[PDB]
Amino acid sequence: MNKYTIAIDLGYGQIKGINQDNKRVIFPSIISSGKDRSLDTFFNSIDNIVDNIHVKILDEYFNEKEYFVGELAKRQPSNSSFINRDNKINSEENKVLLATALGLLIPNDLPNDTKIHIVTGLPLEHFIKQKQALNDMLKDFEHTIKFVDHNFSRNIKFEESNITLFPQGAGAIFSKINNDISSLLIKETFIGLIDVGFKTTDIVVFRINKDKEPVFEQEMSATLDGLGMINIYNTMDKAFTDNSRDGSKLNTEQLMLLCEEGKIFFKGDYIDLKKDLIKARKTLSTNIINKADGLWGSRKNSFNSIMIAGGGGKVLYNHLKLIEPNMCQLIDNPEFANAIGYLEFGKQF
Amino acid sequence: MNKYTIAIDLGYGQIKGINQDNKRVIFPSIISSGKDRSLDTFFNSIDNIVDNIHVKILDEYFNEKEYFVGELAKRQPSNSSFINRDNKINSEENKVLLATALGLLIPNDLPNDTKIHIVTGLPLEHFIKQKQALNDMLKDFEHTIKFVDHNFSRNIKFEESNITLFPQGAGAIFSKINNDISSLLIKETFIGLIDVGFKTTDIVVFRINKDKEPVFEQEMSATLDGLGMINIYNTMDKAFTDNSRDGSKLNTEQLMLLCEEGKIFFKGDYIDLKKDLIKARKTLSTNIINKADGLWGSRKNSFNSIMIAGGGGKVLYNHLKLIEPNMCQLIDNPEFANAIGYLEFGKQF
Amino acid sequence: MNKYTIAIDLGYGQIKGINQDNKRVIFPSIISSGKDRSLDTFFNSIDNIVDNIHVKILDEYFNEKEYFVGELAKRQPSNSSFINRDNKINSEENKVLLATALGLLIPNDLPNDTKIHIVTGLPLEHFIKQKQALNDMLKDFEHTIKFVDHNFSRNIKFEESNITLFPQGAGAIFSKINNDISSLLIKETFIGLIDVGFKTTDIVVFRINKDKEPVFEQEMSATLDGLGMINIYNTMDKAFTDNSRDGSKLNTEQLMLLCEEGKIFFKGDYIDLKKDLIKARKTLSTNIINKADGLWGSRKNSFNSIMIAGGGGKVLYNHLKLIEPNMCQLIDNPEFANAIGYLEFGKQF
Amino acid sequence: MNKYTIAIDLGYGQIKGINQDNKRVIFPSIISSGKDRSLDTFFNSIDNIVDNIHVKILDEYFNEKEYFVGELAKRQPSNSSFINRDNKINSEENKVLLATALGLLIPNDLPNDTKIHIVTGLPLEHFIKQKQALNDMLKDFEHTIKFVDHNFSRNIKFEESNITLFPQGAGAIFSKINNDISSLLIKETFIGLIDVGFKTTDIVVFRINKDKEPVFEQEMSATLDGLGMINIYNTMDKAFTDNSRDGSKLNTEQLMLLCEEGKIFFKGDYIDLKKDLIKARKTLSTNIINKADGLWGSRKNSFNSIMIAGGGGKVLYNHLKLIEPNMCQLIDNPEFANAIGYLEFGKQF
Ligand SMILES: Nc1ncnc2c1ncn2[C@@H]1O[C@H](COP(=O)(O)OP(=O)(O)O)[C@@H](O)[C@H]1O
Ligand SMILES: Nc1ncnc2c1ncn2[C@@H]1O[C@H](COP(=O)(O)OP(=O)(O)O)[C@@H](O)[C@H]1O
Ligand SMILES: Nc1ncnc2c1ncn2[C@@H]1O[C@H](COP(=O)(O)OP(=O)(O)O)[C@@H](O)[C@H]1O
Ligand SMILES: Nc1ncnc2c1ncn2[C@@H]1O[C@H](COP(=O)(O)OP(=O)(O)O)[C@@H](O)[C@H]1O
Ligand SMILES: [Mg+2]
Ligand SMILES: [Mg+2]
Ligand SMILES: [Mg+2]
Ligand SMILES: [Mg+2]
């Protein structure tokens, strides 16, 4: 039929989703208990729904749990701690976040026959490893969302021949840049996509064949498991605890505020940690270059375009240029590189 | 299980219907005899049934008749002339329109034990006049519809106590806004819907009381019978022959294409009649404003919200704004004001 | 490697085909039994195979048959009479023509693993009627062709999902001009191809929409079945016997030579029949114009570009101009309008 | 009859224009809100309507706004600030300046059944770069002007192919001197036209062939955006605060008074800035000495006669002579060179 499509991602740093109609949302993976918002309604109006997501989630048993979630929960000191957030794909923490972006990307008044061909993403070492667990949950995912301060609801339910599972970074270079660089890729060149994830960074390569079509190399491509931006939040956390000379610990919000700037305004003064920030990024820079060449022998010289993606690829790109300068480049929308890739390569159905 | 609900409208310009599950269809009120289609199927793929209603309808003899109806009938050279279309609500011209309106708005594989609360409509001055004529038709309406080139059939038959008649503009402002207009209605005010239709324009008012509940008045509210879009097509038909000066008179499509734009593509050229389109709309704007003061004395100053409706109100919303500017506003669906107004006020039972 | 593409036409006057590499062949639709040729080779050197198709064709018995086809068959006294030629698309008369059309349009030393997207054609009113007859023939067409005195052979066999049927005039104006006519089609206009062929004349229209995409109509478009060049040959055959007054009736060549010029070289003299050639063309011009008003009401004024096609349209382009002068124009290949229209609209897959 | 011809100039300094009847108007590009000049109507004679442009402008929804524009807007302190007027071609600010030029260049007793040809200009860089927007805005233009205090009006609207686009200063020497300078241009010489406008400055050249016919040279000719008379208002503005040292800034009127006079009468006394005036006048002349030679190497020696245009360079003619003295010259109407060059080369149609 005219059944719809929403491409989301389970990215532990920040959830990145897009519909079939190219409207796209982004919010961190932060949930909290939802509390009633009436006083703050009068001071500051909620124009951006994404900035202030308080929301209600009905279940199949017709109970409900309110949630400060996303940008709104990040302001809360009582949120989910998010730096030890569990990797379990069947967690209710994942259920709320998967219910969240669906509530923001289902348009108004769709026909219920026109269901949603949802497209997800799994890590490369986790795709075969954790396939049916998400297929268990998305089969069982049936709820009803209710937006606080916005007063619109969506019923949600998913079936087979609407669920569709792809690995992470699959359609990012299988399409939407493969349609463009096909004049440049000629014969048995290798394209290299490195999605710098928050927790885990994926490194995926495709070989173009005789027929200028991509074929996949699992023995040249894998996941930097635990290598990525989460170490920068981990190390720079310890870099303040000795520089403050107090044992003072920043919260979840200030740490995410830190590693975009490096200068947190602590007790009337900016504690400067620019020295360790350039150090830890170059610490992460070398940890990506060498470990990619654990999968890349002299075949690195068979590269035509080393592409990097993810939110972590943006702030590394100048230092992460040193994989192979003037051959490497950056994808256009680095965070949504999965999500735009999940859309077009999710249009196989 | 509970009984199903469909709210359609037999409006003279176009059939405007909606079901219980908030799915709506719209197509112009033109019928045509159906002819065999597999050839035009092959040239262009049919993704919309509404453009291409080739359809078979059984009767009391169980004899099928092929029909082109809706957009497909307008392109036919042999369709209904549509300017001399009958007002007899029990006519077969009204039956095939009502068959397709009930044919599209039923989903597949429903249980056959349940029945449907169908809610039709009448003109305001012709509700009492044409009450039993449609009551006789809906009791007589035993037909089985069969969509050619889509191949799904419906058995459409209704006994007593399932049909529900309302006048036009009845539940569009009594209901359908009552959850949102309740803060605007305060004490002894008049709300008013002005539906600009094909043959007629329709004026309906509702006095709200001290206890903030609307109640009807019939001497402030009537049907502008024969005054509507039909004065625009007949005037602009003469405007082409005044501008062609050849005796060439427009067909069914060319006149209907004209008053939507004003530039008929005649002999490789657009024949400009934008100014006469303004004049025919202004005389229609003359004949609704001056007739409103016939129904309204100083009580036009007793308004809190004028609403205008009809597809003819879409091109005239700023033009018919001169009744009471900065108080009149647009109904949220200009075509579907009557149908959803039939839906919410039909679910009151 | 990718699959090859050939677009031929089985037109009643002459086979008009073209391949993927834009090489075209044309020869009249006359077959003849082949006889041994080494003698006429010695008198005159053969630089054109099309004039001199002596050719052997294997079958399901793998039994070769010699054939003279094309220009070489027309000079034979014992060829097909060509006025009583069958319309049965699965006939061997159609097979040998289709064998040579596929025989010429394949270059030498192609890989045997790849297959060819062959695109044939049908009359418009006989597309649905003769759909499975050619589908049965193309599934049955297992033949090996062998060109005598040129000595290159082709193994021509096609399985399922390689043939592609289209009506005549389908892709000639839907495609083949769509990159150039897109600036001319603006809003709700009709383009029209008029192919003047041997047995029939063919009328096909396409309404463009508001979104500037053409869509087909079948009640404004049909096959002028039995009305075409065949009315000119039969009338001018009687025109010679009216002018010879001896009982001498023209043969296959003399009648075909006549209506191209009008002066058959009979007994050392040109017998003038130029005026009767004008009369037979004018009655054909009568029987396409008056039949056009049968398909077109005032919608002839809804044209932006008439196109005329067919080899019969070449001698009638200024003569059939009287439908709508200063708007009708000539297709860029009067013969090859259908074939390249099959080629571009066959490459859409 | 023949469709009426207009040629206007969209110059940001002052809007110029001339009609088919060769009557020409000029007024500054300043707008304001119109207010009821009825008190002064009793006091002083309102005869120069160009001095006194109070004007109402209807639209397609019949919602008018009053406008002081041009010379009457110069006396207003409430006018558009005009040092920061938007360079968008599709502004209402342009439309008010456009419609003012319309009703002044359409005299009474003319056939309004005949359409209106207009010939406008662009920046020479932006003639293709911002081409379609002016092509859109003129086709979108449909209003109705109302002349306050003079009580006549024009219906104002444009279809396509009545508007005509030629670049700034194109036809001023391509036409309008081509019947006179043909004796002067001999062989391989370059005529050169320099439009010293307010915001921008054009320099345009034409190679002539062997056959004494001009041809365009896009790489010896460009637009000097940010160079022109707006530098003189920019430089002398701070010179007043340099001279007065008060913190008082001149308004739009006093500043435009200053760079046409040089001696502002501030606070009961003439405050002198004549020394810095010529200093900027040499400086603007310096910036045209450079940038012309940036496109003119030794090919400047191949000239025959430079022309210069613009009201800015008109008072610069001695200092701007220094580029090529006694070969450069000034066009006779430095304001109306472009509009007559629009009109004369617009009289091809
Ligand atoms: N402007 C920015 N400044 C600093 N870090 C950023 C910025 N934008 C994104 N990031 C980092 O990138 C991460 C987002 O990665 P993302 O592409 O969402 O991968 P994942 O799919 O693993 O969540 C965040 O955790 C954040 O630290
Ligand atoms: N986009 C449009 N442009 C011009 N006219 C329109 C448009 N949409 C609707 N109309 C006019 O409105 C009429 C539809 O009125 P409608 O609300 O269906 O009333 P009714 O119930 O009497 O049929 C049509 O006949 C048509 O002329
Ligand atoms: N130069 C010509 N002079 C006269 N008649 C011609 C000429 N070229 C083509 N024709 C006529 O056009 C016919 C070819 O039509 P064609 O486009 O092949 O249609 P079809 O597809 O029906 O065979 C021939 O039978 C012939 O009579
Ligand atoms: N008599 C004058 N004295 C001083 N400056 C003048 C005079 N006449 C015109 N100008 C200057 O010339 C400019 C007019 O340029 P114009 O030819 O209209 O170019 P544009 O097409 O860019 O508006 C004005 O801004 C003004 O400063
Ligand atoms: Mg990721
Ligand atoms: Mg109605
Ligand atoms: Mg043909
Ligand atoms: Mg200028």
Preferred mutation among B33, B37, B39, B79 to probe C, highest tally of C CBs within 10 A: B39
The string over D174-192, giving b where at least 16 C-beta atoms fall within 10 Å of a residue's C-beta and e elsewhere, is: bbbbbeebeeebeeebbbb
* Centre of ligand 3 from the C-alpha of residue C52, in Å: 20
Q: Are B29 and B97 in contact (CB under 8 A)?
A: yes
Q: Which ligand does the CA of C30 lie closest to?
A: 3
Given an 8 Å threshold on Cβ–Cβ distance, is B254 in contact with C174? Answer: no
> CA separation (Å) from D150 to A303, B22, D48, D146?
76, 57, 10, 9
**Any atom of ligand 2 within 6 Å of the Cβ of B13:** yes
The DSSP call for residue C162 is -
> Taking CA atoms, what residue in A is nearest to B24?
A111
> Taking CA atoms, what residue in B is nearest to C214?
B44
* Centre of ligand 1 from the C-alpha of residue A40, in Å: 29
Given an 8 Å threshold on Cβ–Cβ distance, is B22 in contact with A109? Answer: yes
Q: Are B201 and B194 in contact (CB under 8 A)?
A: yes
**Any atom of ligand 2 within 6 Å of the Cβ of B258:** no
Q: How far is CA D114 from the centre of its chain?
A: 27
- State residue D345 phi and psi, 5-degree precision: -80, -15
Q: In A, which residues are within 8 Å of B105 by CB distance?
A: none
Q: Are B138 and B118 in contact (CB under 8 A)?
A: yes
* Centre of ligand 2 from the C-alpha of residue B12, in Å: 9
Given an 8 Å threshold on Cβ–Cβ distance, is D61 in contact with B318? Answer: yes
Q: Which chains share 3+ C-beta pairs under 8 angstroms with D?
A: B
Q: Are D110 and D62 in contact (CB under 8 A)?
A: no
- Pocket-testing residue among D18, D26, D229, ligand 4, by greatest number of atoms within 8 A of Cβ: D229
Task: Report the C-alpha gap between C21 and B214 in whole angstroms.
Answer: 76
Of C297, C126, C307, which is closest to residue B79 (Cα–Cα)? C297
Torsion of CA A328, A330, A335, A337, to 10 degrees: -80
> CA separation (Å) from D189 to C314, D184, D222, D233?
50, 9, 18, 36
| Residue A37: half-sphere exposure toward Cβ, Cα within 13 Å | 23
Paired tokens of D254: 């006093």
User: Residue B150 burial by CB count (10 A; 0-12/13-18/19+): exposed, middle or buried?
Assistant: middle
Q: In B, which residues are within 8 Å of A111 by CB distance?
A: 21, 23
Task: Report the C-alpha gap between D183 and D212 in whole angstroms.
Answer: 9
Contacts 24+ apart (CB under 8 A), C186-190: C186/B265, C186/C212, C186/C304, C187/B265, C187/C212, C188/B257, C188/B265, C188/C302, C189/B265, C189/C302, C189/C303, C189/C304, C190/C217, C190/C220, C190/C299, C190/C302, C190/C303, C190/C304
Q: Which chains share 3+ C-beta pairs under 8 angstroms with A?
A: B
Of D312, D94, D78, D275, which is closest to residue D195 (Cα–Cα)? D312
Contacts 24+ apart (CB under 8 A), D108-111: D108/D152, D110/D4, D111/D1, D111/D4
Q: How far is CA C4 from the centre of its chain?
A: 22
Task: Report the C-alpha gap between A129 and B158 in whole angstroms.
Answer: 56
CB pairs under 8 A between B and C: 56
User: Does A109 contact B at CB distance below 8 Å?
Assistant: yes
The DSSP call for residue D78 is S
**Any atom of ligand 2 within 6 Å of the Cβ of B14:** yes
Instruction: Encode D14-74 in three state secondary structure.
Output: EEEEEECCCCEEEEECCEEECCCCCHHHHHCCCCCCCCCCEEEEECCCCCCEEEEECHHHH
Q: Which chains share 3+ C-beta pairs under 8 angstroms with B?
A: A, C, D
**Any atom of ligand 2 within 6 Å of the Cβ of B74:** no
User: Count of residues for chain A?
Assistant: 349
Scanning the structure block, which residue is given the tokens 């439908």?
C323
Helices (H), chain C: 39-43, 71-74, 92-104, 131-140, 170-173, 178-181, 230-244, 252-261, 274-295, 337-344
Residue type, D199: K
> CA separation (Å) from B228 to A139, B123, B126, B167, B224?
53, 13, 16, 17, 8
Preferred mutation among D58, D59, D60, D62 to probe B, highest tally of B CBs within 10 A: D62
CB pairs under 8 A between B and D: 10
**Any atom of ligand 2 within 6 Å of the Cβ of B85:** no
Q: State whether residue A90 is helix, strand or coil.
A: coil
Given an 8 Å threshold on Cβ–Cβ distance, is C167 in contact with B43? Answer: yes
Of A131, A134, A98, which is closest to residue A7 (Cα–Cα)? A98
Given an 8 Å threshold on Cβ–Cβ distance, is B265 in contact with C215? Answer: no
The DSSP call for residue B323 is G
- State residue C17 phi and psi, 5-degree precision: -130, 160
Residues closing a segment before a gap in chain A (C–N exceeding 2.5 Å): none
Scanning the structure block, which residue is given the tokens 């928050």?
A198
Of B72, B242, B55, B22, which is closest to residue B144 (Cα–Cα)? B55
B39, B75, B251 ranked by CB distance to C298: nearest: B251
The DSSP call for residue B263 is E
Question: What is the helix (H) or strand (E) element at residue D342, kind and residue range?
Answer: helix D337-344
Task: Report the C-alpha gap between C31 and D188 in whole angstroms.
Answer: 66
Q: Are B66 and B55 in contact (CB under 8 A)?
A: yes
> CA separation (Å) from C143 to A114, C5, C59, C139, C161?
49, 18, 5, 11, 18
Dump strand ranges (E) for chain C.
4-7, 14-19, 24-28, 31-33, 53-57, 65-69, 116-122, 143-147, 153-156, 163-167, 190-196, 201-208, 214-217, 223-224, 263-265, 270-272, 303-309, 329-330
Helices (H) and strands (E) in chain A, counts: 11, 18
User: Does B325 contact C at CB distance below 8 Å?
Assistant: no
* Centre of ligand 7 from the C-alpha of residue C264, in Å: 26
D61 min Cα distance to partner chain B (Å): 6
Dump strand ranges (E) for D91-200.
116-120, 142-147, 155-157, 163-165, 190-196
Q: Are B60 and B142 in contact (CB under 8 A)?
A: yes
> CA separation (Å) from B161 to B119, B319, C22?
11, 42, 70
Task: Report the C-alpha gap between B319 and C46 in whole angstroms.
Answer: 80
Task: Report the C-alpha gap between A123 and A141 in whole angstroms.
Answer: 21
Paired tokens of C348: 């859409």
Task: Report the C-alpha gap between C308 and C196 in whole angstroms.
Answer: 7
Contacts 24+ apart (CB under 8 A), D130-136: D130/D89, D131/D165, D133/D88, D133/D89, D133/D90, D134/D89, D134/D90, D134/D165, D135/D160, D135/D163, D135/D165, D136/D90
B37, B257, B266 ranked by CB distance to C301: nearest: B266
- State residue A332 phi and psi, 5-degree precision: -65, -65
Task: Report the C-alpha gap between C275 and B123 in whole angstroms.
Answer: 68
Task: Report the C-alpha gap between D292 and D309 in whole angstroms.
Answer: 14
User: Does A151 contact B at CB distance below 8 Å?
Assistant: no
Of A345, A343, A349, A348, which is closest to residue A21 (Cα–Cα)? A343
Task: Report the C-alpha gap between D209 and D193 in whole angstroms.
Answer: 18
Rg (CA), chain A: 21
> Taking CA atoms, what residue in D is nearest to B277?
D60
Angle of helix B252-261 versus helix B230-244 axis, rounded to 10: 100
Q: In A, which residues are within 8 Å of B21 by CB distance?
A: 111-112
> CA separation (Å) from C120 to C96, C137, C176, C194?
14, 12, 16, 19
| Residue A90: half-sphere exposure toward Cβ, Cα within 13 Å | 10
Please list, in sequence order, all residues whose beta carbon lies within 8 angstroms of the beta carbon of residue B113, skipping any fewer than 6 positions away.
B1
Please list, in sequence order, all residues whose beta carbon lies within 8 angstroms of the beta carbon of residue D69, skipping any fewer than 6 positions away.
D27, D30, D31, D32, D53, D55, D96, D97, D100
How does DSSP assign B63-78, residue by residue?
Answer: --EEEEETHHHHT-TT
Please list, in sequence order, all residues whose beta carbon lies within 8 angstroms of the beta carbon of residue B48, skipping any fewer than 6 positions away.
none
Q: Are D312 and D13 in contact (CB under 8 A)?
A: yes
The DSSP call for residue A49 is T
B42, B78, B248 ranked by CB distance to C301: nearest: B248
Q: D 216-275 residues with CB below 8 A of B?
A: none
> CA separation (Å) from C149 to C71, C100, C103, D194?
16, 15, 14, 74
Q: Are B122 and B165 in contact (CB under 8 A)?
A: yes
Neighbours of D70 (CB within 10 A): 27
B23 min Cα distance to partner chain A (Å): 6
Neighbours of D326 (CB within 10 A): 7
Of A140, A170, A141, which is closest to residue A154 (Cα–Cα)? A141
User: Does A113 contact B at CB distance below 8 Å?
Assistant: yes
Of B192, B191, B188, B190, which is closest to residue B210 (Cα–Cα)? B188
Q: State whether residue A153 is helix, strand or coil.
A: strand
How does DSSP assign D104-117, residue by residue?
Answer: HHS-SS--TTS-EE
Q: Are C303 and C188 in contact (CB under 8 A)?
A: no
The DSSP call for residue D2 is P
Q: State whether residue B56 is helix, strand or coil.
A: strand
| Residue D90: half-sphere exposure toward Cβ, Cα within 13 Å | 10
Q: State whether residue A66 is helix, strand or coil.
A: strand
The partner residues of A26 in beta bridges, in order of sequence, read: A16
Q: Which ligand does the CA of A311 lie closest to?
A: 1
Of A169, A106, A206, which is closest to residue A339 (Cα–Cα)? A169
Task: Report the C-alpha gap between A119 and A341 in whole angstroms.
Answer: 10
Task: Report the C-alpha gap between B29 and B13 in whole angstroms.
Answer: 6
Helices (H) and strands (E) in chain B, counts: 10, 18
Q: In B, which residues are within 8 Å of A109 by CB distance?
A: 22
Preferred mutation among C130, C165, C188, C301 to probe B, highest tally of B CBs within 10 A: C301
Given an 8 Å threshold on Cβ–Cβ distance, is D159 in contact with B272? Answer: yes
Measured from the CA of C16, which atom of ligand 3 is nearest? 18
* Centre of ligand 3 from the C-alpha of residue C255, in Å: 13
Q: State whether residue A167 is helix, strand or coil.
A: strand
Paired tokens of D313: 């360079």
